[PDB]
């Protein structure tokens, strides 16, 4: 059974809402496990208190940089980086959850939630989950993004874990 994780989102510290995700452990078990464990904080680090540092409306919302809070950091449960596990799953539409990276085999902790079909990312970013509840909360987060991704308010993961 594929695991479910949730994030409770806040805007300048004001609760916004919860987003849950199905993680496709059946297809990308290593990548799904990294995200799952970073969501639970079970290795002693992870997403709780981290921010969505890059939000581009009509494209995606990016976060998971829990070390440097700006797109230059993050780490996996396996080490600083791990390989692209596979590209079975494609960027089919809004709600897809996919790994951000800095080129091949550079997955750490950074992720994005698509708010459009982004097929040009097929075979360059590892798709590992989708939004199951709260896509409306992801849609609301776009109210605080910009063309270049800079956010107009501080968007944080106030709480996260496994359902």
């Amino acid at each position: 059974v594929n695991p479910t994780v949730f994030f409770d989102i806040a805007v300048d510290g004001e609760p916004l809402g919860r987003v849950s995700f199905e993680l496709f452990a059946d297809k990308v078990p290593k990548t799904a496990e990294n995200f799952r464990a970073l969501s639970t904080g079970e290795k002693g680090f992870g997403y709780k208190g981290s921010c969505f540092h890059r939000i581009i409306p009509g494209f995606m919302c990016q976060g998971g940089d829990f070390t440097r809070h700006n797109g230059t950091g993050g780490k996996s449960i396996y080490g600083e980086k791990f390989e692209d596990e596979n590209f079975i799953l494609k960027h089919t539409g809004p709600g897809i959850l996919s790994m951000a990276n800095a080129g091949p085999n550079t997955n750490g902790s950074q992720f994005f939630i698509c708010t459009a079909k982004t097929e040009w990312l097929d075979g360059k970013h590892v798709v590992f989950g989708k939004v199951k509840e709260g896509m409306n909360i992801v849609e609301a987060m776009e109210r605080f993004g910009s063309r270049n991704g800079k956010t107009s308010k501080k968007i944080t993961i106030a709480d996260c874990g496994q359902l």
Partner: peptide, 8 residues
């Protein structure tokens, strides 16, 4: 600085 993923 051109963070990935890149838009189209």
């Amino acid at each position: 600085p051109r963070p990935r993923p890149r838009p189209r």
